[PDB]
Design a binder for this molecule. Structure first.
Ligand SMILES: C[C@@H](CS)C(=O)NCc1ccccc1
Ligand SMILES: [Zn+2]
Ligand SMILES: [Zn+2]
Length: 229
């Protein structure tokens, strides 16, 4: 079951995987939830996405200390919006190595974000160049193409049935693709489908703005994105 921990919510998804959820008021849209992941890989912890704020991200680290009690080796963030990168300074203050798409780091200042310490680059087929993602353990990082943003990346967790679409993917009952202010509307559908094709064995799809779902999240997202073209 969900665990409320201060103003955040944590949910175990697999033996070594938890979802973190944090909230920010968007005046005129309500208090918007954003999800990321926490993964235990042996004697260390890996984080996917910050919370919206530094204070909330420090709370994620406090939860990790209490519930796992192992060092956080690294964090990877999935694009340069506040829900994914707003807590970078808290990660740095904690001594955690941080990674983002090179393009996310380039965009960070203009988006009001602090850049990660390290830049990921990607092969033409979308897989991360392995030298740029050292010690990522089970995290398999894939650039699916431009969609929710130009820089959006996705992460599969090897040895589990889980893949994380970030803000690219919405659940199978969603009415819309949310805010498309920075979206590539022409390429969105193809990028959603490329995410699915990169992680064909993932049966649990985790995403930023919906609860975990089946692969129908991918097909439904792509079908909605077909309407943007
Ligand atoms: C939840 C957040 C980040 S995905 C969101 O939807 N922000 C609004 C927004 C998104 C893109 C461009 C301008 C404004
Ligand atoms: Zn976003
Ligand atoms: Zn988002």
């Amino acid at each position: 079951g969900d665990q409320r921990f201060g103003d955040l919510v944590f949910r175990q998804l697999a033996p070594n995987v938890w979802q973190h959820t944090s909230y920010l008021d968007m005046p005129g849209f309500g208090a918007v939830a954003s999800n990321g992941l926490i993964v235990r890989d042996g004697g260390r912890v890996l984080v996917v996405d910050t919370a919206w704020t530094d204070d909330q991200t420090a709370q994620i680290l406090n939860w990790i200390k209490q519930e796992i009690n192992l060092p956080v080796a690294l964090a990877v963030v999935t694009h340069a919006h506040q829900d994914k990168m707003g807590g970078m300074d808290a990660l740095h203050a904690a001594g955690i190595a941080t990674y983002a798409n090179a393009l996310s780091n380039q965009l960070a200042p203009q988006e009001g974000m602090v850049a990660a310490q390290h830049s990921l680059t990607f092969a033409a087929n979308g897989w991360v160049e392995p030298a740029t993602a050292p010690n990522f353990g089970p995290l398999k990082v894939f650039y699916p193409g431009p969609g929710h943003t130009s820089d959006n990346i996705t992460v599969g967790i090897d040895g589990t049935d889980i893949a994380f679409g970030g803000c690219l993917i919405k659940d199978s009952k969603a009415k819309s693709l949310g805010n498309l202010g920075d979206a590539d509307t022409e390429h969105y559908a193809a990028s959603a489908r490329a995410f699915g094709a990169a992680f064909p064995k993932a049966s649990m799809i985790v995403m930023s703005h919906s609860a975990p779902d089946s692969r129908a999240a991918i097909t439904h997202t792509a079908r909605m994105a077909d309407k943007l073209r």
